[PDB]
Write a protein that binds this ligand. Structure first.
Ligand SMILES: O=C(NO)Nc1ccc(Cl)cc1Cl
Ligand SMILES: O=C(NO)Nc1ccc(Cl)cc1Cl
Ligand SMILES: [Cl-]
Ligand SMILES: [Cl-]
Ligand SMILES: [Mg+2]
Ligand SMILES: [Mg+2]
Lengths: 396, 396
């Protein structure tokens, strides 16, 4: 066909507009080059880029057939001989997630302003969740180089306006992630296992103070581990099982793992805690990988020491490479989720680093930060919508 | 906030509408429940479902602020106190791909009609490719049970109107595919290796007739293999290397594999051809898995026989399970692409079975069929757009 024509239908959605418009076009020389349609709050837009003979493009018959059929039923229709108009839009360069409880218009306006300031175009906005948190997504086209500046703006917006705001590369490659590791304490699991253990010794006070200092980047993680575990010296090893039984998963943890299994993720945990507690849950949760420290035991009693290599800050990164090597997943397809400075190296080595209700030391280095006590908000940052979770869960 | 209000902006896109609308809303009690926006051919729709005090929802101030700001700059705006309106649309149940060269308005209208007949709602239409073939996608919501009837309608439409039309489940699970196997002859590779070999014996005629019969489901694959390879009796084994060098990849084959490596796919080939030819290319293409038959050789000469287990129709399925077992991928996340009846069991065992320029016997059983001599149209059926391929390829 000689030339291109653009036909744009808009108005209040009605049954059968799509079919009707393409019957009409078939009565002319028409081949489709591109078609985009959506209905947002009963507003229909139907954009049809079309290929027909110069004979048909500049004759009133085509226009009149379309104009009569569309207007008859209560819609509007445009018909312009394009020729120089793009055929198919280009993909977004990035996607921006906004989670809040709530998201104020002010918060969202600040995001939109920071975006529009940097020359970043908004290609689509959709809601990804109404529960447990309101989640919104902006697919954007970021001018080359503004990548860095935009993340900073949105980090300022995030904290000023009390929403989480994460900017992810929306490329083919960086999207097909396949491996996720969770920190255990205060990430996959509520609270600190060492504090639960330290309680059985009447040491929960000192132990929680040191844990706070260690997780904030105030103290070396190795020394802090040795000082806190030392408070357990003399407890029967029976206490490991008991503390194990007290563990409460992070809200949405189960939803998070189930959903990630549906997507084919390899899943593991990497903690400075204790393999003898973590392994029960690792099994229950059908996890693929567990790296953890080890309590020393003598005649069935704890000594106050841990064994062998201490999984320290650097050791958490090392474990994620082990995992991603054993799993044949390139580091750029890996996800790490943590809450403490214990985790800075893990997150930084991972393709996507997610700080989860995390001390300032980790937020400052993370790729994205989540502020709400639901681990399944991790899913939203992995391109999953609430409705998709609910639909797949319903099927079962 | 007490009650929900719906604010719908529409009209000709302009810079800064998004930001402006949310500044205005921030001057009231407004929290966002849902936001959807898109621009199709310079037509903007912005749909904002919002949460504000009953004080603010039924007062003219909110309405007047919005109405004045939006209309000033040349757009229209609706404001209706919803309350009972859905917050976030539900996900599509299926997606429908339409590829043609060309796609007539008639072809597309037939699809739209077959869809609308079954009660299937259209949620989005976007173009996924302008090259090498025009590709369109319909995300749809299919009433429970109509799954089967809709695939048949669209198969009738496909052949009557000369477009490929594939209906895929658009669930979380069935989307995260991770393993693809290709048949070699007339799928990944142009032509039939056995015909190239049979030529060196002056037997290409008989050999191509039998291959046609075997690939159409006319003859048992085992007997057809034995009859055709027998025509090679007496050729020097040197001929394997020569035929190897003559091989032309299917157009778009390289693009297909490169793109699938970007998505983290495990990739292999499963052929009734000959490991000594296929292995050179399997290596060149950095493939993960090769199952193939084996030419018998004696004093450096071929005997006319193949060795060991013949990979027959059932043996091609067996190999895909081997591959998907070695790869820890559930069969429902597997993709098989083939052209002949040789392939019926492979395709049927795979999560997605793709017949590629295939004899009628295979199209009849396939999950989807492709009719154009470009193997990268396989990508479009795997949720990849042309623009995404081009963008990632550009990066390098
Ligand atoms: O993961 C943690 N907080 O997020 N804390 C932590 C827990 C148990 C142990 Cl043994 C050591 C530490 Cl540093
Ligand atoms: O894959 C094929 N056609 O699509 N053909 C074929 C090729 C080589 C051999 Cl040895 C046997 C067969 Cl049946
Ligand atoms: Cl332990
Ligand atoms: Cl061989
Ligand atoms: Mg932790
Ligand atoms: Mg073949």
């Amino acid at each position: 066909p000689k030339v291109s024509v653009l036909i744009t239908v808009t108005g209040v959605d009605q049954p059968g507009v799509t079919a009707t418009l393409f019957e009409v076009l078939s009565r002319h020389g028409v081949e489709l080059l591109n078609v985009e349609q959506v209905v947002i709050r009963h507003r229909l837009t139907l954009g049809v880029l079309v290929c027909c003979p110069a004979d048909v493009a500049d004759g009133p018959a085509l226009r009149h057939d379309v104009e009569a059929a569309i207007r008859k039923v209560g819609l509007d229709v445009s018909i312009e001989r394009s020729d120089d108009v793009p055929i198919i839009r280009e993909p977004s360069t990035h996607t921006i997630f906004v989670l809040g409880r709530p998201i104020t218009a002010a918060a969202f306006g600040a995001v939109a302003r920071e975006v529009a300031a940097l020359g970043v175009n908004i290609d689509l906005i959709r809601g990804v969740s109404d529960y447990p948190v309101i989640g919104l997504e902006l697919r954007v086209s970021v001018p080359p180089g503004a990548d860095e500046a935009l993340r900073t703006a949105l980090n300022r917006v995030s904290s000023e306006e009390h929403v989480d705001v994460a900017v992810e590369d929306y490329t083919l490659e960086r999207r097909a992630k396949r491996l996720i590791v969770f920190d255990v304490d205060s990430t996959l699991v509520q609270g600190e296992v060492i504090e639960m253990l330290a309680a059985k010794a009447g040491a929960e006070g000192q132990v929680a103070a040191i844990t706070d200092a260690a997780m904030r980047g105030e103290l070396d993680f190795a020394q802090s581990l040795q000082q806190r575990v030392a408070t357990l010296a003399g407890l029967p090893a029976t206490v490991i099982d008991e503390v194990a039984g007290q563990l409460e998963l992070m809200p949405g943890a189960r939803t998070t793992l189930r959903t990630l299994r549906r997507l084919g993720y390899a899943c593991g945990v990497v903690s400075g805690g204790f393999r003898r507690i973590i392994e029960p849950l690792a099994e229950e949760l059908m996890l693929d990988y567990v790296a953890a420290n080890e309590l020393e035991i003598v005649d069935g009693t704890l000594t106050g020491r841990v064994v062998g290599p201490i999984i320290d800050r650097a050791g958490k990164a090392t474990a994620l490479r082990e995992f991603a090597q054993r799993a044949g997943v390139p580091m750029a397809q890996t996800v790490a989720v943590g809450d403490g400075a214990n985790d800075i190296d893990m997150l930084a080595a991972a393709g996507l680093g997610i700080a989860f209700n995390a001390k300032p030391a980790l937020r400052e280095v993370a790729d994205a930060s989540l502020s709400h006590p639901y681990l399944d908000t991790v899913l939203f940052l992995l391109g999953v919508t609430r409705g998709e979770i609910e639909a797949a869960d319903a099927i079962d």
